[PDB]
Amino acid sequence: PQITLWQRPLVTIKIGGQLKEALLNTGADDTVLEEMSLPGRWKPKMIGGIGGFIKVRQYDQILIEICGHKAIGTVLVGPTPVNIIGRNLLTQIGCTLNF
Amino acid sequence: PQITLWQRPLVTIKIGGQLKEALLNTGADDTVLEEMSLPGRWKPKMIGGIGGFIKVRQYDQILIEICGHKAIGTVLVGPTPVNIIGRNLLTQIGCTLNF
Numbered sequence A, B: 001p002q003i004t005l006w007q008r009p010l011v012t013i014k015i016g017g018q019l020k021e022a023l024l025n026t027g028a029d030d031t032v033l034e035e036m037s038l039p040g041r042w043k044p045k046m047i048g049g050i051g052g053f054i055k056v057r058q059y060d061q062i063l064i065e066i067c068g069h070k071a072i073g074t075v076l077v078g079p080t081p082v083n084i085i086g087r088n089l090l091t092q093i094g095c096t097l098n099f
């Protein structure tokens, strides 16, 4: 659907068997989720935002259903204040900006 | 225009007589720009992101031209890593998400 920006663009996602709410974030290259348990193996990583850096765990090729659209890609898990769907997955569900 | 997200959605802006590049950021409530000289009077403020918090100067009713669309609103100035156009201004230039 089209989404306007008067409110935070939140969507329901299903990942790792669990249901969550996440922000569609054009200002994020990567997808970053709050602490949650995801099955596979991972690789430590450091990502930088507005207030500095956080350590996250990088999971590759994770299935995510974003507003009922399926995508597979990298998901980062760590102490982000909010679940963020980044451009890496936005492209996969055909998400675009319009003005 | 319609913008895809295979790359960072960067646009050219004009503010305070100066030309800058800024990221269209659906994940940001407010607009935040790197240290620059802005004429107005300002109020101290504190904003939080992924790695913690930064102190910014809040300027109200600042004119901004974003890809040739004019908007007037609050602009925050401080040590952000990148110039961010947030939802407060995105709504004014009629910007939407689409998928």
Ligand SMILES: COc1ccc(C[C@H](NC(=O)O[C@H]2CCO[C@H]3OC[C@H](O)[C@H]32)[C@H](O)CN(CC(C)C)S(=O)(=O)c2ccc(N)cc2)cc1
Binding pocket: A023, A025, A026, A027, A028, A029, A030, A031, A032, A047, A048, A049, A050, A051, A081, A082, A084, A086, B025, B026, B027, B028, B029, B030, B031, B032, B047, B048, B049, B050, B081, B082, B084, B086
């Ligand atoms: C490294 O350079 C940057 C680049 C972009 C950003 C923007 C944020 N996204 C962000 O934190 O992205 C992180 C994690 C996701 O992947 C990466 O994408 C680019 C960036 O390297 C890194 C996001 O879009 C908005 N943020 C908020 C989200 C966490 C919900 S905010 O900037 O902290 C921000 C906070 C309060 C206000 N009022 C205004 C902005 C910040 C700093």
